Design a protein around this nucleic acid. Structure first.
Ligand SMILES: N[C@@H]1CCN(c2c(F)cc3c(=O)c(C(=O)O)cn(C4CC4)c3c2Cl)C1
Ligand SMILES: N[C@@H]1CCN(c2c(F)cc3c(=O)c(C(=O)O)cn(C4CC4)c3c2Cl)C1
Ligand SMILES: [Mg+2]
Ligand SMILES: [Mg+2]
Ligand SMILES: [Mg+2]
Ligand SMILES: [Mg+2]
Ligand SMILES: [Mg+2]
Ligand SMILES: [Mg+2]
Lengths: 209, 482, 482, 208
DNA sequence: GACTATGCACG
DNA sequence: CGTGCAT
DNA sequence: AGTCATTCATG
DNA sequence: CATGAAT
């Protein structure tokens, strides 16, 4: 077992944590409420489900232990009720690469688990940037009335709780597929096989200065 | 061309080298600062870098590389591992390094790789290093021949007993348990006054081990045997308790456990006792420890005899274990089985060399300075003349000789005078200089006392050992039973 | 508690966040200095630490960690693997890093881990950093706000073409082969004179890529295509020779292979032909590469069409490959497909920027001192009343003020005067000072010229490029064939 | 694991037993591949004297040694079926290198006596400073510095010329010149029993 | 960025 | 066994 | 002190 | 299938 399980098996409040790296992976085990929170360290960069073969996608340890740990099976063989967690939260560094990961994961939770996503079940944790913690460069100027977090790993097991894991002190972005169509196009282009649409998308949307 | 050694002799030379080195320079602590060489290097390096309790944290890897390139020519994983340990408050009684991030847990899971963690010395580690600039400890060259390293730190408190060691050389090995900082100090204070103190008086201040893990230590007799010969076998038992529940279902709650024990394995090994049913009627083991408390609750059955469960757990798990002293350390360059006395003595011995060295250093400093000040007070009364005379001089050297010959100033005073910046000729108040002249004689005096009178020196050793104690003292965690 | 976002939005402020960073700040070289950020940080750091070609090697880990705590908040593996590359001379035409130890082979076996190796900048890497201390390039805060780092090096030689780059971000990739140093300089030298130069003419100076592994580059028209649009496919083929062995059997001897190609795999794949008999005639495939040469022997059987074998291997192995240009770089904060012209021009634009800054800088310094010397030359004429005045002054602050108001000195001068050591009052030789006022006037003119004569500026830039050429120029390794 | 010699020839070939992959890698580059193989040893080697001939045949390092030396181990040891003419031990100049030499020699002495009493087992002598071997050979080179912390901080072509090149290298050759005073030497130092050794250390190791 | 095996002395 | 510096 | 896997765009 | 900075 790569995964660290919740103490009591209540798929009614049980949350599955997808953490980037064993560094933060562990710093997450320690800081948790063990009765209802499990931890699954994601060792590496999660595979691109939109780019690769549904043959190779299945023979990928990081995806398997998610198909097994989620307990519903992927594809259409997906029973959204025989799952094992109410909320599935994606916990990553507040960095560029963490962002990249938030991506690759999403595309999987849509390509191969649309239901879990449409059922408003998938979330995205929101770790802090500064320390009296803040989240945006504006919320720092208000506290000036000074540590800078380079990611989840350089954070202490007690601190990560009060700030991003505590179901009271935390703020979770809740993924919803609002317009199933204008969404299919976005996941399809960013993470797709075709390079030239991505290029154009970056050119039209990304401001270089 | 080839030379022929005897197998008997090649094996002799080679194992001898390893043997000696790995003894005095790897697995065993110096009896005075209670540090293995890598530990010492870590601390010293971090200090040289201003990576201290008061200044920012610092990516660990930065530190580790600096250590590996200036002082400790070995794996970066050894260095970090050791650096990590010194920062884990469940292995050290009084942590030497503070680390932001994942340093592990009592569950024994691994720390974050050094890329993730940042670190700095603890306030108290500061004290191990106190006065080190002041030429107070013998330095040698680093493996490089590029930089000098301390061979022992000043040790403003007696680290060897306070944080313990362990400990696997060749021919010898060591195991010394942590001790309460406040008590070890009380012990050393007494022995400073009564050199000849014997173990029994000593144990009135230093009753025995104080594991950061806490718990219960049974065996007052073997503690003495230990404090006496260095070896000895005490007993360490978990702090238990009983809660009551619904249906008349009693519960065993554990809150402290045996030093050096892996909470996780302890929990599984217990739960195994349930599964295998090695003793009648356990319900469910559960680790309910969260970030601010240790709690293994062992739930029992409706008609369950709690005092047999508990006793089986003590006998057949690590819920209670045997801690064996084997106090080995490195006195005068070689390994020594040592008891509570040789230890506490060498510490005083050392603190002594340290306080003398420090005092000579400060004394010479104040002296060289007093000298300059005496110089300046004279000048002021002949300022015009000295200016006039410099002006008439030819280069800088001529000025100085002229000062010497004409006013009996000394080389060192002439230099001082002649290299004052013009604006100094404004703040020309002597009453202020006279004040410093005095502050300085008083200082020189107080220090000369210390050097000339063993009793005045030991009186410092004591003053200081108390401040440390006042400043860092804490309660016992482990309780004693004979 | 919660806040909702669209799947169409959370994939927007993410992948667009990643994209930009990976593109601006990771996998693509800056067109002026030819460095991806990791590399530029590596070089800046090693240089900041006097870890250079003329001083001793420094343990790789010491370096690596310093980079990681000062500038590059990332993997130490990533940092070392990069440092290692900059040091291997079958990947770099002009290596930027010198590494004592096992830094790898063309067989591509792993470099020793960072705990074993030591390293320092190469002499020519000095040239990449030349004049950094002179405010030539723009700096910015580090991820940490403790230190400023350069965004681009001064680049005294045109690295991006000389060494090459590669090359995989998101939405763009890059492949730029290495080039002979002398040639790229000739090219830029020409274009400094003729801003409006045709590729055809430039190519008289820059005939095509020069891989450090040599070999044969085939495809004149395809090089042009690349030098012009930045995309192009050339063929790279191994240097071959044939040896008539005794028995009527011929032997193909390989002595150079294609850039980026693994000698170990290449031998394998070739022998895997021999073993499957895909083409017929191969007898033994035997690598004879020693420490001072490349040599693969392909022993063919007696009577066997050595052309059919040799050609088979060219098509079906890496004995011969297609090398694709895909020259992308970061002009103005953004990725740009570019050819020889935008490249050389961007470099030239940069050197210009640099040489101007550099010159504003020394001139500033030379001004500030000339101003003081003017001040001092004056004091000498009025020394007596000046000492006099500093005398009647209340304090340093009042002396400067007094100096100003009484005799027109300026802050800058008032300060220099008021902080002279008493012994300066010995000297009264205006003649040495006047020789310096002259020297400084001259220095300033020369610089000022440079700053305000576009032409003057360029001949300097050329003067320097030629010196770089004279000192580091080396012969082609890769032959060209239409 | 092993890197062969480009040509089998049980009479001329040398097997280099190297300390750790990184050194074993500088060696794979310096060798004369025609007659020099390289088998790198990963970490401290198993004490064939302290442990059970059971767990001994389970140590990969040891298996991949009995098999490449190609003559089996112990009593079933065919001295003649040997694979190499000279077996060379290359470890760092440092103490742990010294330690390994010990661990290996005890193996070759205990489970392959024949190859040891045959003077086939050698020990490379890398250079301490840079080219001088002994502290004295150093003071000489200052008339008419880089100290080496291990074989791994040395460059490939430097390695060759100084230790691996037959024409230019100095070797020790472990000769058992007394089967009695060379047994009581292994068992005291590598034996299961700790007291003897604690004594031997106490008697022969001067701690200054 | 986890996993994998050794030496050493000791109950 | 499991310890902690070393390979 | 090696070994395993993923990104990204390209021919 | 590699490539080389990244997880
Ligand atoms: N089967 C497993 C899946 C993950 N994995 C690997 C792997 F093969 C190699 C590396 C690796 O070189 C590395 C590094 O710092 O250079 C870092 N990492 C970790 C940051 C992710 C690696 C990982 Cl996880 C193999
Ligand atoms: N053939 C064996 C299999 C296991 N093994 C191991 C191993 F398991 C762990 C480590 C290890 O922790 C380490 C370190 O730097 O801390 C260094 N080394 C290398 C210097 C030797 C290790 C090695 Cl080789 C090699
Ligand atoms: Mg990160
Ligand atoms: Mg390790
Ligand atoms: Mg027990
Ligand atoms: Mg890697
Ligand atoms: Mg081909
Ligand atoms: Mg070594």
């Amino acid at each position: 077992g790569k995964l660290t399980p919740a103490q009591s098996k209540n798929p009614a409040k049980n949350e599955l944590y997808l953490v980037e790296g064993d560094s933060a992976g562990g710093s997450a085990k320690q800081g948790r409420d063990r009765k209802f929170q499990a931890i699954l360290p994601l060792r590496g960069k999660v595979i691109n489900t939109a780019k690769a073969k549904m043959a190779d996608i299945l023979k990928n340890e990081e995806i398997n232990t998610m198909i097994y740990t989620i307990g519903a099976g992927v594809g259409a063989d997906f029973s959204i009720e025989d799952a094992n967690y109410d909320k599935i939260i994606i916990m990553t560094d507040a960095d560029t690469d963490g962002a990249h990961i938030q991506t690759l994961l999403l595309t999987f939770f849509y390509r191969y688990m649309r239901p879990l996503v449409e059922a408003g079940h998938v979330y995205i944790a929101l770790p802090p940037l500064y320390k009296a913690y803040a989240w945006t460069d504006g919320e720092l100027e208000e506290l000036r009335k000074l540590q800078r977090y380079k990611g989840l790993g350089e954070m202490n097991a007690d601190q990560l709780w009060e700030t991003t894991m505590n179901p009271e002190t935390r703020t979770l972005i809740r993924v919803t597929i609002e317009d199933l169509a204008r969404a299919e196009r976005r996941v399809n282009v960013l993470m797709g096989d075709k390079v030239e649409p991505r290029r154009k998308w970056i050119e039209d949307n990304v401001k270089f200065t | 061309n080839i030379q022929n050694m005897s197998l008997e002799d090649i094996m002799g030379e080679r194992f001898g080298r390893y043997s000696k080195y790995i003894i005095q320079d790897r697995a065993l602590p110096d009896i005075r600062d209670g540090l293995k060489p890598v530990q010492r290097r870590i601390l010293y390096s971090m200090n040289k870098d201003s990576n201290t309790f008061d200044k920012s944290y610092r990516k660990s890897a930065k530190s580790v590389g600096n250590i590996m390139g200036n002082f400790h020519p070995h794996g970066d994983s050894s260095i970090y591992d050791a650096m990590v340990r010194m920062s884990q408050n469940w292995k050290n009684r009084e942590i030497l390094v503070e680390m932001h991030g994942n340093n592990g847990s009592m569950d024994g899971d691994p720390p974050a790789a050094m890329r993730y963690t940042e670190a700095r010395l603890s306030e108290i580690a500061g004290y191990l290093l106190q006065d080190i600039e002041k030429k107070t400890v013998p330095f040698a060259w680093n493996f490089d021949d590029t930089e000098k390293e301390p061979t022992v730190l000043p040790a403003a408190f007696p680290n060897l007993l306070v944080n313990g060691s362990t400990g696997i050389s060749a021919g010898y090995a060591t195991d010394i348990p942590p001790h309460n900082l406040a008590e070890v100090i009380d012990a050393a204070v007494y022995m400073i006054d009564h050199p000849t103190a014997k173990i029994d008086k000593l144990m009135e201040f230093l009753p025995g081990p104080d594991f950061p893990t806490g718990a219960i230590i049974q065996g007052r007799d073997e503690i003495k045997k230990a404090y006496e010969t260095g070896k000895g076998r005490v007993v360490v038992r978990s702090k238990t308790e009983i809660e009551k529940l619904k249906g008349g279902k009693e519960q065993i709650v554990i809150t402290e456990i045996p030093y050096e024990i892996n909470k996780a394995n302890l929990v599984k090994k217990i739960d195994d006792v349930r599964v295998n049913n090695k003793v009648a009627g356990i319900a469910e083991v559960r680790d309910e420890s969260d970030r601010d408390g240790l709690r293994i609750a062992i739930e029992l059955k409706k008609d369950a005899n709690t005092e047999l469960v508990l006793n089986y757990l003590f006998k057949y798990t690590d819920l209670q274990i045997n801690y064996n002293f084997n106090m080995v350390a490195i006195d005068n360059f070689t390994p020594r089985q040592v008891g509570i006395v040789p230890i506490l003595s060498s510490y005083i011995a050392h603190r002594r060399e340290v306080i003398l060295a420090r005092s000579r250093f400060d004394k010479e400093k104040a002296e060289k300075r007093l000298h300059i000040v005496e110089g300046l007070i004279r000048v002021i009364s002949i300022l015009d003349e000295v200016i006039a005379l410099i002006r008439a001089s030819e280069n800088k050297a001529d000025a100085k000789e002229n000062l010497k010959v004409s006013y009996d100033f000394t080389e060192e005073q002439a230099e001082a005078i002649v290299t004052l910046q013009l604006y100094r000729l404004t703040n020309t108040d002597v009453v202020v200089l006279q004040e410093e002249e005095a502050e300085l004689r008083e200082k020189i005096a107080m220090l000369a006392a210390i050097i000339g009178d063993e009793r005045t020196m030991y009186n410092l050793m004591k003053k200081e050992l108390r401040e440390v104690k006042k400043k860092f003292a804490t309660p016992r965690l482990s309780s004693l039973e004979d």
